Design a protein around this ligand. Sequence first.
Ligand SMILES: [Cl-]
Lengths: 92, 91, 92
Amino acid sequence: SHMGDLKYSLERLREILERLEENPSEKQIVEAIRAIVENNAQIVEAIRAIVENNAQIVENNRAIIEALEAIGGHNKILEEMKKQLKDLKRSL
Amino acid sequence: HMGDLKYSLERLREILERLEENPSEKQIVEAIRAIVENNAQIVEAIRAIVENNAQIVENNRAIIEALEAIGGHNKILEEMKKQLKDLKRSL
Amino acid sequence: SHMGDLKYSLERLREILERLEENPSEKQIVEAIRAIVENNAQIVEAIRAIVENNAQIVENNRAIIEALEAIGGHNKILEEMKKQLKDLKRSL
Ligand SMILES: [Cl-]
């Protein structure tokens, strides 16, 4: 969506640029500037979506640290049970 | 950056209006200057994103480690069920 | 690579702008516009790589969810083992 719109907006701008070099004009210079502005508006919208989406990076990190915490808990529990078993089997 | 980014383009949209209203060599050049300054902010925003994206790779590494540990715990648990089952059957 | 190219491209554009304000001319205005287009084309390529790269955020999330699922499976097993042992040691 954004990138399809982005590269189309740039190809439209590349067309204006060619006409401009073919046929320089105040009207075409201004029209080229307008197209640049509209393209920059799409670049800003694209960056905005990336930033919004980047919030998932933070929540992935938080869940990883929780997972590591739980894994560390399990490890301590597992070391107890090995001691219990060996002790208790050595028992009998 | 985002607030600065969208403000920078709003400023740019104003110049564009004046440009189409009263074209002028001065205003064309001033519009070009504003575009450059806007592009300089776009590049800075992309730079912060790339820097920030390094966290994606470290999240992946930690995930892989977590999966390794979980697989380790798994093999331990299946042996433990064996000893318990066998020990209870012992008696 | 991308961002190294990005800041060079804007450095090139900043110098054109300097010459433009020093010696305005149709040729230099058009040349400035061309440089802007080429810079925008690089901005778009950089965003494209970021979006491609951001797919890793989704795969990290899926793997975390799996890891959490497994941890919850282990947790229930451990509580079963906890009771087996205690009752089996109280047993005798
Ligand atoms: Cl991530």
